[model samples]
Target chain A: DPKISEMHPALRLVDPQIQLAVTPKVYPIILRLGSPLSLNMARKTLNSLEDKAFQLTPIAVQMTKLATTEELPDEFVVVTVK
Target chain B: MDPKISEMHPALRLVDPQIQLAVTRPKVYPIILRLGSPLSLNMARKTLNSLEDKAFQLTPIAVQMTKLATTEELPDEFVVVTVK
Candidate 1:
């Protein structure tokens, strides 16, 4: 079975610099939702990032649906990177 | 402060029109989204659609769903809505 961690998994301080850093360091990730495979891939991507000690800002992610004329994907996923 | 758990601040809840309510239909009701429209129509619709999409797993999409309540720099709070 596929297991995906909760949104915005806890921040992992793998780098010495992050622990010593004072300011908030952030990065953004974007993913598209058009099929099942894409969603699964998205989970894998987030899980992988967390495994590598990256932090996620769950609330920062955005998902939007647009008409065919809008030409955007059904949904999008974003994450913060440190 | 960081979230204690998955920060799923739901901006809206999409209930199937087919589902009957507990009480009789009331023609008059208060609209809670009066303060502002920080939440967009398409965004709300998309969120509901994604939540119900049977083809995909909810885990990944749910993670991304957290953005729903946070896009407009809203207060550190959660809100729920029922769109008919």
Candidate 2:
């Protein structure tokens, strides 16, 4: 049960040069996250970009911890974070 | 202040022992953050870390300029943490 499209779906344009474009063309999809099973085919527009992460900037921040080898713990308590 | 030992701030022993005590044995007051150096003599120990995913969603580039004026909807998943 994962059809997922409850944001009031249903749209139609089907790009004839994006529906006879006179102006209004900007494809600045800088940051897009998930769920883009887009649909709207009078000509073409079906989508899936997949888990996107591109926070463009002068950016820097990193941290991750996920472990399992039966979650080893023979006593080591060195905690540091600033 | 926060200049805890390591011979009175020798860069607090660089990592500056950010989680210090590479696991030996030592414990003190008001919650530990530093000060533990030795490897089995007078003994010392340390390491305990965490700082989970930062909560964020995004909306202000002046309301992202009407959310990029719906250039054909579909987007909302604020992924994060980039280090380079």
Candidate 3:
């Protein structure tokens, strides 16, 4: 992993993409994500349903099928990166 | 914090720390985040502070356990639980 990181410095900060899958339970169910997402960003993004927030674990660092960007404006960039 | 919280949620094992941490110095990890729109250093600090507030609410608790069975006294299992 270090070799890959050192070889590709640009990807040094590349993290496993957090894929979110939401479902409804008693009130609000868990939103199992792909990898992980920072609590603040996830909470901020899912502001409308501010009640449901839970654990995040990096089960594995999956390969980047596509670029992942933060915040809304970068939404365009991730799409462009693909 | 909230006793109700214990029953309120599942994934309790990961509810807090699932692993032990050192007493003298706890392990630290870094996360990377890119901005949709770049901001000034002051603004960045401001944003960081907001994140830190949520972190403050999630103070880590260190609980010691002796899970390993042994006739002799052994190392204590210090479990640190926190939310991020």
Candidate 4:
């Protein structure tokens, strides 16, 4: 068969978080981090990994947990928030 | 806050295997990150660039700095990286 290519046009951008509502392949990884050091440590670890395909920066939110700060360790949980 | 002292190596969450069947029309979302000593404006740009290099479509949208409730631990000055 002869080479065939079609010229497609136009595109855009928006909130990726909302994409989850539609069930996109892109899944977010939530890391419940503590101090700045924990964040740095997480970054370095992720960076050093052979697979750097994952998203580097994550959505950092202040979640109120039942456990106190002292009870939890830095970079406590790394899981899918959803 | 004192850094957690441990010999354990940091680990990351893996992507769900079923994500393939869940594909839909491309959508966009803002990836929010805190701005501070570890990750700064330039660092944020670099991160975004890396994302783009990996085929993640990101726009040239300006970074948004928003404040959080006083009780929040993260810095009030954070940047939003929009991606699709």
Q: Score the docking of each candidate (DockQ).
A: 0.03, 0.02, 0.02, 0.04
How much DockQ does model 4 earn? Answer: 0.04
Sort order, DockQ high to low: 4, 1, 3, 2
**lDDT winner among the candidates?**
4
Rank candidates by lDDT, best first.
4, 1, 3, 2
TM-score each candidate: 0.14, 0.14, 0.16, 0.17
Per residue, candidate 2 scores C-alpha lDDT tens digits across B1-84 of 333233332122221111121111222111111223221111111133323422222222210011122213222311111111
Determine which window of 10 residues in candidate 4 chain B has minimal summed lDDT. Answer: B37-46
Q: Top model by TM-score, which number?
A: 4
Clashes of each: 3, 13, 2, 6
Better of 1 and 3 by lDDT: 1
Per-residue lDDT tens digits for candidate 4, residues B1-84, read 213212112311111222211113443332333322222111011123232342222222122333333222222222232211
How much does each candidate deviate from the true structure in C-alpha RMSD? 21.1, 27.5, 19.4, 20.5
lDDT of 4 at A25: 30
By how many angstroms RMSD does model 3 differ from the true structure? 19.4
Cα lDDT computed for each candidate against the true fold:
0.22, 0.20, 0.22, 0.24
The alpha-carbon lDDT assigned to residue A33 of candidate 2 equals 18
Residues A1-80, candidate 3: write the lDDT tens digits: 34222422122122323321112111111122223322321111122333433224333333332222121121111101
DockQ score for candidate 3: 0.02
Off by over 4 Å in 1: A1-5, A8-82, B1-30, B41-84
lDDT of 1: 0.22
Fnat, model by model in order, equals: 0.02, 0.01, 0.00, 0.01
